[PDB]
């Protein structure tokens, strides 16, 4: 169940108004700027990038994109492999050494071992992946349906079977 409030609506409206006004101001700035040529083109490109990103931005979409990137990062981290990362680190160290040497000829070397540890052990368990339901300007609530108690006692001396159940009235929201 999604919970939305008039405050959310006013927030989105004011956000849109402010974004529109700032886009107008940015367009004014860009036009004044347009009002060495490589540098001028670079400045125009910077202001254009600012305007484009400002137009793209929206609070709900912004939080959605942030959540998307966070989920991607979690998936990357959970699948992270130390052998692959160690090889990548060796690649980067070699790149740095090759660079610094290239500026020298155009200093002692730095080295990192090609370490591996999966050879000695490999996990046998299964780890479920991370799951985060998407995030928007609205609030989410899984409504409570029912609560029920099931009890059974078996013994020739005495027998009990007690049930206690209580739940929500979900017929309508107003009631």
């Amino acid at each position: 169940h999604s919970i939305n409030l008039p405050f959310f609506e006013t927030l989105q409206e004011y956000f849109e108004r402010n974004r529109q006004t700032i886009i107008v101001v940015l367009e004014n700035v860009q036009r004044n700027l347009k009002h060495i040529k490589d540098y001028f083109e670079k400045l125009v490109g910077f202001i254009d990038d600012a305007v484009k990103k400002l137009n793209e931005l929206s609070f709900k979409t912004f939080i959605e994109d942030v959540n998307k990137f966070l989920d991607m990062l979690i998936k990357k981290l959970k699948s992270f492999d130390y052998h692959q990362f160690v090889d990548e680190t060796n690649d980067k160290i070699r790149e740095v050494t090759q660079r610094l040497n290239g500026e020298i000829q155009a200093i002692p070397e730095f080295i990192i071992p090609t370490l591996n540890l999966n050879d000695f052990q490999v996990p046998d368990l299964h780890i479920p992946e991370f799951q985060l339901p998407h995030i928007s300007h609205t609030i989410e609530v899984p409504t409570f349906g029912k609560l029920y108690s099931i009890l059974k006692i078996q013994s020739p001396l005495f027998t009990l079977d007690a049930n206690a159940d209580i739940g929500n009235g979900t017929t309508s929201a107003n009631e």
């Binding site: 979690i74 981290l77 959970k78 992270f80 130390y82 080295i111 990192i112 071992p113 370490l115 540890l117 000695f120 052990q121 996990p123 046998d124 368990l125 299964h126 780890i127 479920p128 992946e129 991370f130 799951q131 985060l132 899984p142």
Partner: protein
């Protein structure tokens, strides 16, 4: 003393009856290098004596140190040897220590080296006393950063043999535990006591998700005097899958004493849809 450098040599010889003391120290100075050697031997009797030998060599960008000493007391003996090589950023420490008295001897191995700014260490200790061996090994390549641990502890005896093996890694993000233990217990005081040990523990962890499981079986049978056949058979196994979206666990506990047994079945559930637990307490008991 000369433009070449200082030279110092001294010898002090003293002896009478069983005692002979031969001491010499050779100290030479040459350029940017030092040479020294102190070879000292103190003989109190053929099987009762002390030997010390220290030899140090200093040269530009390298150190060499040798230490060899020997001690003997007829029925007892002790020997030790330690190598030390050091140069800029490279360390190599190795040697041996050995103490023995008749058959009962202890062997130790130590070797520490540092290369590529990563420190490696290996130690081996084995004791063999009165026909009982103890084999505990600390394995190689404990780096010190993003490190790993391996071990092998083994005790062997007629009444009991114990074997323990462990492996774990402390890499930046992911964690793992592989613990496996086995123990057989045999003891006869007031009847046979068969102490059996089955203990396995495994743990794996990673960002935003954790899981584990304990697997233990405990069984012990006691054939005590007075025809008492007592069997203690405890069996518990644990597990739980943990991560923010879904959470649950399980615990199987089986315990029994002779003809009386209890077993409980537990399953913990915590997920978006529901939370709940279920319990089944079943008992078997004797006596009126």
């Amino acid at each position: 003393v000369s433009q070449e450098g200082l030279k110092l040599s001294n010898d002090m010889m003293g002896s009478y009856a069983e005692m002979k003391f031969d001491h010499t120290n050779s100290l030479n100075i040459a350029g940017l290098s030092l040479d020294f050697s102190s070879k000292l031997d103190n003989i109190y009797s053929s099987d009762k004596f002390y030997k010390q030998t220290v030899n140090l060599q200093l040269q530009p960008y390298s150190l060499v140190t040798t230490l060899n000493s020997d001690l003997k007391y007829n029925a007892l003996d002790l020997t030790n040897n330690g190598k030390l090589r050091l140069e800029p950023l490279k360390l190599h420490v190795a040697g041996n220590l050995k103490g023995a008295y008749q058959n009962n001897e202890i062997k130790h191995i130590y070797a520490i080296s540092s290369a590529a700014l990563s420190a490696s260490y290996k130690a081996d200790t084995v004791a063999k006393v009165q026909g009982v061996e103890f084999s505990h090994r600390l394995n190689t390549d404990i780096a010190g950063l993003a490190s790993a641990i391996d071990m092998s502890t083994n005790y062997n005896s007629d009444s009991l043999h114990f074997s323990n093996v462990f492996r774990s890694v402390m890499a930046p993000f992911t964690m793992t535990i592989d613990a496996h233990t086995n123990g057989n217990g045999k003891l006869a005081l007031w009847g046979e006591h068969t102490g059996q040990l089955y203990s396995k523990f495994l743990l794996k962890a990673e960002p935003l998700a954790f899981t584990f499981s304990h697997d233990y079986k405990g069984s012990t049978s006691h054939h005590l005097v007075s025809r008492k056949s007592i069997s203690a058979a405890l069996e518990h196994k644990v597990s739980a899958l943990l991560t923010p979206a879904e959470q649950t666990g399980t615990w199987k506990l089986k315990t029994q004493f002779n003809n009386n047994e209890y077993s409980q079945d537990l399953d913990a559930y915590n997920t978006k849809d529901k939370i709940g637990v279920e319990l089944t307490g079943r008992t078997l008991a004797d006596l009126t």
